[PDB]
Amino acid sequence: DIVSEKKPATEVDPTHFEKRFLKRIRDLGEGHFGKVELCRYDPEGDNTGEQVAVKSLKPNHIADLKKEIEILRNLYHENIVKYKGICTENGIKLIMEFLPSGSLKEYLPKNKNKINLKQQLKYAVQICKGMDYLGSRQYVHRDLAARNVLVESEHQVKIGDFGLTKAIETDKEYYTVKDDRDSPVFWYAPECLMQSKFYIASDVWSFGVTLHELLTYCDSDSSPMALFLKMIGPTHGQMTVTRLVNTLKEGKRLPCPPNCPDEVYQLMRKCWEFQPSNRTSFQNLIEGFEALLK
Numbered sequence: 220d221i222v223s224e225k226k227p228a229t230e231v232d233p234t235h236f237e238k239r240f241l242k243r244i245r246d247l248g249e250g251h252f253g254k255v256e257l258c259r260y261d262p263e264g265d266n267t268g269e270q271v272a273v274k275s276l277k278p279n280h281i282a283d284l285k286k287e288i289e290i291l292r293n294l295y296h297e298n299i300v301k302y303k304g305i306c307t308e309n310g311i312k313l314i315m316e317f318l319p320s321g322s323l324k325e326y327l328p329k330n331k332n333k334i335n336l337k338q339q340l341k342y343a344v345q346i347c348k349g350m351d352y353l354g355s356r357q358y359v360h361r362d363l364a365a366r367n368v369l370v371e372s373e374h375q376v377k378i379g380d381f382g383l384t385k386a387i388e389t390d391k392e393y394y395t396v397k398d399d400r401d402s403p404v405f406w407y408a409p410e411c412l413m414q415s416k417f418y419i420a421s422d423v424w425s426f427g428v429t430l431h432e433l434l435t436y437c438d439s440d441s442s443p444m445a446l447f448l449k450m451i452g453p454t455h456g457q458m459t460v461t462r463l464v465n466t467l468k469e470g471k472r473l474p475c476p477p478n479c480p481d482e483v484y485q486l487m488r489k490c491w492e493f494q495p496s497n498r499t500s501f502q503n504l505i506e507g508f509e510a511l512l513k
């Protein structure tokens with residue numbers, strides 16, 4: 220008789236999502252050769268399955284996606300989006316929990332009435348706690364902006380994208396980047412713009428700019444890009460970044476957001492010391508905000 224293979228152990232992996240049951244609903248966002256879509260994982264095929272956020276490659280940067288997947292899989296913090304699993308074809312898709320409120324960019328313009336200064340400072344503490352957790356794992360985020368901060372509820376935010384996240388080598392203080400063509404220059408510290416060097420303090424600088432967005436309720440007209448382009452001029456093209464570096468070297472910074480008390484603005488200015496070594500830490504920011512909350 221014919222010889223077949225004995226059926227062995229088949230324990231179902233809860234982190235393995237089958238392609239055939241992962242049904243696309245809509246696009247959520249894009250960023251650095253990746254795209255994020257809302258999908259329903261529907262193995263029963265009746266629209267009752269869980270909604271998930273799915274990151275995949277836009278149709279060679281497969282290595283970058285795999286590295287991002289491995290980082291997120293191992294991060295466990297209240298203010299970091301939850302990894303759910305993967306969908307494997309060499310292809311791979313990252314499956315994450317879906318946060319329907321979106322990012323601070325979508326949420327803040329629509330909920331100004333519900334979100335007061337006290338709530339903004341509580342979101343600022345939560346971003347700092349997620350970032351301090353990331354730093355303790357020796358990672359530099361490199362893309363900290365309000366568009367990457369997801370709203371779990373009126374009371375909770377989570378850092379929701381790790382597309383640019385890099386490990387800082389033990390006993391080294393920074394990561395040197397090579398691919399910088401689509402850098403978020405208006406959120407970047409001078410060392411990132413001048414030498415393409417990324418420190419934990421470079422994320423503190425980016426946090427300061429994110430805090431500025433949070434305080435302005437992510438209004439497009441007072442965005443860090445709109446504000447810096449008004450300061451340096453918007454028709455410089457390829458000369459924009461040197462003009463930005465020059466402006467920062469002169470000591471010019473984003474102005475105090477409307478209705479922001481000076482005490483909060485002073486904590487923000489501490490993120491923006493020209494030299495990385497003079498900048499505040501995430502732990503000291505948490506202390507500062509908590510002092511203002513009680």
Ligand SMILES: COc1cc(Nc2nn([C@H]3COCC[C@@H]3C#N)cc2C(N)=O)ccc1Cl
Nearest residue numbers: 247248249255272316317318321367379380
């Ligand atoms: C951008 O607008 C929306 C986004 C969401 N959700 C998400 N967005 N993202 C990323 C999408 O790409 C940009 C960066 C974002 C980050 N962080 C992840 C999620 C998610 N895990 O739920 C939900 C609703 C709306 Cl309207």
